[PDB]
Design an enzyme around this catalytic site. Structure first.
Site, mmCIF file in Angstrom:
data_model
loop_
_atom_site.group_PDB
_atom_site.id
_atom_site.type_symbol
_atom_site.label_atom_id
_atom_site.label_comp_id
_atom_site.label_asym_id
_atom_site.label_seq_id
_atom_site.Cartn_x
_atom_site.Cartn_y
_atom_site.Cartn_z
ATOM 1 N N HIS A 21 0.862 -1.189 0.000
ATOM 2 C CA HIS A 21 0.000 0.000 0.000
ATOM 3 C C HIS A 21 0.888 1.226 0.000
ATOM 4 C CE1 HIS A 21 -3.935 2.336 1.060
ATOM 5 N NE2 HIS A 21 -3.022 3.301 0.876
ATOM 6 N N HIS A 23 1.996 4.898 -2.765
ATOM 7 C CA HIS A 23 1.569 5.761 -3.868
ATOM 8 C C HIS A 23 2.729 6.524 -4.430
ATOM 9 C CE1 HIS A 23 -2.636 5.720 -2.550
ATOM 10 N NE2 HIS A 23 -2.119 5.670 -1.323
ATOM 11 N N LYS A 135 -8.636 -1.226 -5.712
ATOM 12 C CA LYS A 135 -8.668 -0.427 -4.491
ATOM 13 C C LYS A 135 -10.079 0.150 -4.234
ATOM 14 C CE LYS A 135 -7.396 2.404 -1.111
ATOM 15 N NZ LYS A 135 -6.329 3.369 -1.422
ATOM 16 N N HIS A 167 -9.315 0.972 1.965
ATOM 17 C CA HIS A 167 -9.029 2.110 2.849
ATOM 18 C C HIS A 167 -10.195 1.977 3.864
ATOM 19 C CE1 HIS A 167 -8.452 6.556 3.963
ATOM 20 N NE2 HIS A 167 -9.605 6.226 4.555
ATOM 21 N N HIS A 196 -5.276 0.024 6.474
ATOM 22 C CA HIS A 196 -5.074 1.015 7.535
ATOM 23 C C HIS A 196 -5.515 0.480 8.864
ATOM 24 C CE1 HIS A 196 -4.344 3.328 4.120
ATOM 25 N NE2 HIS A 196 -5.546 3.887 3.947
ATOM 26 N N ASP A 199 -4.450 1.662 12.316
ATOM 27 C CA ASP A 199 -4.957 2.945 12.790
ATOM 28 C C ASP A 199 -5.740 2.803 14.090
ATOM 29 O OD1 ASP A 199 -5.779 4.987 9.830
ATOM 30 O OD2 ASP A 199 -3.871 4.341 10.742
ATOM 31 N N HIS A 220 0.147 1.906 7.942
ATOM 32 C CA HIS A 220 0.316 3.281 8.362
ATOM 33 C C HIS A 220 1.419 3.411 9.406
ATOM 34 C CE1 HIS A 220 -3.595 5.457 7.064
ATOM 35 N NE2 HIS A 220 -2.662 5.407 6.116
ATOM 36 N N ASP A 267 2.200 3.417 3.231
ATOM 37 C CA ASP A 267 1.234 4.330 2.690
ATOM 38 C C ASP A 267 1.929 5.677 2.462
ATOM 39 O OD1 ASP A 267 -2.077 5.789 3.512
ATOM 40 O OD2 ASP A 267 -1.177 5.308 1.526
#
Ligand SMILES: OCCc1ccccc1
Ligand SMILES: OCCc1ccccc1
Ligand code: NA
Ligand code: NA
Ligand SMILES: [Zn+2]
Ligand SMILES: [Zn+2]
Lengths: 331, 331
Positions: A21, A23, A135, A167, A196, A199, A220, A267
């Site tokens: 994950h 970008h 995604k 997500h 995530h 989190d 994350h 991420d």
């Protein structure tokens, strides 16, 4: 036997150490092309990405999965260019995040399914670059539109074998609703990564999903606003929990017996326009290692905590391979 | 201003000729046409359709159209340039933001947006060098906080470049009044502004009061009517139940009130439309087979029949647009 990347198909063994994950750039559809100066320049962004990818590669990263969808402003040409320049495999995605424009939001589940299939089977835009993952996203209870997206994602996954990654608002336990929708479409939990997930500290939530077969995305890890409690936007985005607290979830899950369902990532990104101006700088100050944070800091931390070498290798190489390998449901 | 920017380059004011001031080649979303061209059959099919329609409008006397599609309407300047050249019709491109901005736009400040609009007007859209000749903005009732920012940036860009501003309004809600107030607060002259979709209201008081202040009134929804389609909710909601004759009569009404120099007429037509329900394009084409040629083929003759003199008709369709589009800085 093959995983589609922005440079073409690769064998499962070529994937190696993979970040699931990430970008290259977190933006919006058409944005990079209409306002490249927001990032200095397209060239500056590409060079930044190449430096970062080369550094991650030096740290052992062989492949990254760029989970940028159409609405995250994914620019496959940029992905291909940086992949080639840095010599890092990049898996592109299809799907829809939480900022779909009207042209997408008004579509039916059937139409969306066709769009996802197009990107996976024929290619993104006119490039021939085929997506290797789907995604999707929710931020609390899914919206009616989001439910359609999840259903279409499930249909496209079932037809192609490509996995789905999400997500979530981990706090809100989004994963349970997501799983419900996917299962209502007949999708195997093994084809899904609930993202995530780090989190939240709710180990009950994590573990219950793991038990059902889902992949848990602890992506994350380096996200933290500690030391920046004074930056509201940053705190909102990054949280006040330490990277160590987040990393400890990996060991927790391992300890509970779910080492085979864990996927770890950062991420990270090289450009970020879909948030307040300057967030990139703030983030880069928080985590200068960028995508290399996982191999440089997290893996050693876990080993120090007693996680064995083979489990670490299993999580960073084996799990991603199994997840990314296109897999059709047995009939 | 001695020249107007078009997708084929600058033209003299005289070359504009009979101009339709609020039109679209395709009503979409940023990046949509490139990502899912099959939604419109194919890019080729859409282009061919647009060329046929532009050629027919041209046969009827239209020399230029102003495509008010913004970044968020999915404006594809390359498509515009292609069709302009193939049909031999001048097309003026727009900058600005409509009502579907993505996060990368919606989180921006007035200063940032200003720079983006200036980029499109002064340097060029994307990497094409095609410069916008108009700025498009919109509200649908009271402006959102972001929309106020857009209107202010639009005014600032217009003040620096001389290019006019045209808007989308919820006419029945008198949005033009709030728009005007915001524009005036930035010091923009009303003469640089067209308050669009004004024929969507039967409140002549509202229209004449804006005209009295110097604004241009865009009566651009003339052929829009769901009469005969009461049964189609989506179409009804979009097109209304007032007849084209009723809308055209507002042109006469404003002329009769002495504001012939402040009227701009158009059809708000398109060749592709993905930002609404699927199939809306077919419904529209059935309602108005003349498409963009509706103005010259039916409206002008209708007005003439109602007593509007030729000189007045020529002034509205040629002179007004020329005056409006000519870049004009405040003295
Ligand atoms: O076969 C067990 C080795 C392994 C450990 C951790 C994750 C996947 C594989
Ligand atoms: O008085 C000049 C003629 C004219 C008529 C209508 C609109 C623009 C100009
Ligand atoms: Na494929
Ligand atoms: Na210009
Ligand atoms: Zn992400
Ligand atoms: Zn329009």
């Amino acid at each position: 036997d093959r995983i589609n990347t922005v440079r073409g198909p690769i064998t499962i063994s070529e994937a190696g150490f993979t970040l699931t994950h990430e970008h290259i750039c977190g933006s919006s559809a058409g944005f990079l092309r209409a306002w490249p100066e927001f990032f200095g320049s397209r060239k500056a962004l590409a060079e930044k990405a190449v430096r970062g990818l080369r550094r991650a590669r030096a740290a052992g990263v062989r492949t990254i999965v760029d989970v940028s969808t159409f609405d995250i402003g994914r620019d496959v040409s940029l992905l291909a260019e940086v992949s080639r320049a840095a010599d890092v495999h990049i898996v592109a995605a299809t799907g829809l995040w939480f900022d779909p424009p009207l042209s997408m939001r008004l579509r039916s589940v059937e139409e969306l399914t066709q769009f996802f299939l197009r990107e996976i089977q024929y290619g993104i835009e006119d490039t021939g670059i085929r997506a290797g993952i789907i995604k999707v996203a929710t931020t609390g209870k899914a919206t009616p539109f989001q439910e359609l997206v999840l259903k279409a994602a499930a249909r496209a996954s079932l037809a192609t074998g490509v996995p789905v990654t999400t997500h979530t608002a981990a706090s809100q336990r989004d994963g349970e609703q997501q799983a419900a929708i996917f299962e209502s479409e007949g999708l195997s939990p093994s084809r899904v990564c609930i993202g995530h997930s780090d989190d939240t500290d709710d180990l009950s939530y994590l573990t219950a999903l793991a038990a059902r077969g889902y992949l848990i995305g602890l992506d994350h890890i380096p996200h933290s606003a500690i030391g920046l409690e004074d930056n509201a936007s940053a705190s909102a985005l990054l949280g006040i929990r330490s990277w160590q607290t987040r990393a400890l979830l990996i060991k927790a899950l391992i300890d509970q017996g779910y080492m085979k369902q864990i996927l770890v990532s950062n991420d990270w990104l090289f450009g970020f326009s879909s948030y307040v101006t300057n967030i990139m700088d703030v983030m880069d100050r928080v985590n200068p290692d960028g995508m290399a944070f996982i191999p440089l800091r997290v893996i050693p931390f876990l080993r120090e905590k007693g996680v064995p070498q083979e489990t670490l290798a299993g999580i960073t190489v084996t799990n991603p391979a199994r997840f990314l390998s296109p897999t059709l449901r047995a009939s």
